[PDB]
Design a binder for this molecule. Structure first.
Ligand SMILES: C[C@H](CC(=O)O)c1n[nH]c2nc(N)[nH]c(=O)c2c1=O
Ligand SMILES: C[C@H](CC(=O)O)c1n[nH]c2nc(N)[nH]c(=O)c2c1=O
Lengths: 263, 263
């Protein structure tokens, strides 16, 4: 199905053998601008735990560019040293992405799909790292949700390829919970398999999101079963990664799905 | 999609609004032949709890016919009185089914698909209750798993309709974990949607089953995430009921699936 592997510098991720689990890393120190022992040690311990629970990737990430870097760079430096898993930097700022990769991040994860700072795409091309382009927009005035999403996503692919990003370094994300009503988020989940025609790996990010709470009427800490459902549906519909808080659980559900769908 | 409701005497179950949850009821007293306060009270308390957690049906059920009845009849009598949910009797014996329905059971649940005691179908026709015909057989020598299953299931439909069972009183079950290798159970899950062509509601029974343990390499008590996956896939593939131990959890996953697939 995928005739290439996701090359992540020292690590390589096979897109065919299993659904890949992206673990979402935790919390700033109230009295520092970054780098402090408490916050960095907590981060490493969480990365390690997620590694132990079946995570394949560690996702690390309103403040200023300077602060954002002072905060995230120490974390990338420790985790990359002490946890042997590829790291993604959760940013949409060109300069943050540069610093993070220098610091040791392997993948860029951009919630604005390179539309907030097109220059991030250049950073991506330059360092030759995979980049995640999530669907986003500042409004929710659609005429055909899926059609519009695919157009939007495609506008991001163009910015990315125009910058020099190789096809094999592009991953897409439907941006669930972003610029979408609850009913719209459900509709996107329902038609997720349409993203496939674009020909790129898809990452799903639904963990504990508000639309699950809207369906089940449950608070964030009570959303493991709902997250689970969305992950299951997502894998059935062909997604290659899921981005989750509950690594132990979701890793188990994914593995079971994989076995059933034959992956 | 379904132009009829499942009529269960005093209760009616709509097949279209939501995935219906069948809760599996618990444990005999070591010093009695049945009816004892401890075992019946435990049963009622479990039924009540499952009712509270989102169960729509309570499933109640090598020993002799006489013992089987002495044991199950008191339970049906209490639960039916004290828990306002339809009851199914988990038996494949004609006389047990008769006694249970007299006792207050609303649905028959036959793991041998009316092939162990064809007369059970007559009991079904007579009392006009829905009957669940599960796929089973004494061997696993298939030539085309799904094709064979559908033939087998169909042999049960014939026994049932020959006995006078109305189409609207027939429910099917793929019999996962029965007469199937682990790889075969996975294949059945993978192609579950084929059961639909037969035109009857489908109930899925995978809870904590051994094939999940075989995939995840986890013991029975550690199979909630795997059960979850199978339930999710099952609903995506169109099943109308799921039969589960973990009612709270599975009810939540199902409800989320329903919302996503639009049910
Ligand atoms: C806003 C929220 C915050 C969080 O959950 O960490 C958040 N950040 N980044 C994200 N990045 C990707 N690729 N996909 C996502 O769905 C997503 C998020 O939901
Ligand atoms: C054998 C096992 C025992 C149990 O789990 O209660 C068991 N009994 N009855 C059952 N009845 C139906 N309709 N579907 C099933 O999958 C099933 C079972 O797995």
């Amino acid at each position: 199905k995928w005739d290439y592997d996701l090359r992540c510098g020292e690590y390589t991720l096979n897109l065919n053998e299993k659904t890949l689990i992206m673990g979402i890393l935790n919390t700033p120190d109230s009295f520092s601008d970054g780098g402090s022992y408490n916050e960095v040690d907590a981060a490493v311990r969480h990365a390690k735990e997620m590694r132990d629970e079946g995570a394949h990737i560690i996702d690390i990430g309103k403040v200023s560019v300077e602060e954002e870097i002072k905060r995230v760079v120490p974390m990338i430096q420790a985790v990359s040293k002490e946890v042997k898993l590829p790291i993604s930097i959760d940013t949409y700022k060109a300069e943050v992405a540069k610093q993070a990769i220098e610091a040791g991040a392997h993948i860029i994860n951009d919630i604005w799909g390179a539309k907030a700072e097109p220059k991030i795409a250049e950073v991506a091309a330059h360092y030759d790292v995979p980049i995640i382009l999530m669907h986003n927009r500042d409004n929710m005035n659609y005429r055909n949700l899926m059609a519009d999403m695919i157009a939007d996503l495609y506008d991001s692919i163009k910015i990315a390829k125009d910058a020099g990003v190789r096809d094999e370094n592009i991953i897409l994300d439907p941006g669930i919970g972003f610029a979408k009503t609850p009913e719209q988020n459900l509709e996107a989940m329902r038609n997720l398999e349409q993203l496939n025609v674009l020909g790129y790996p898809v990452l799903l990010g639904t963990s504990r999101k508000s639309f699950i709470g809207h369906v089940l009427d449950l608070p964030v800490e009570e959303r493991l079963e709902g997250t689970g459902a969305t992950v299951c549906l997502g894998i059935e519909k062909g997604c290659e990664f899921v981005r989750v808080h509950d690594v132990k659980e979701m890793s188990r559900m994914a593995k079971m799905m994989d076995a059933m769908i034959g992956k």
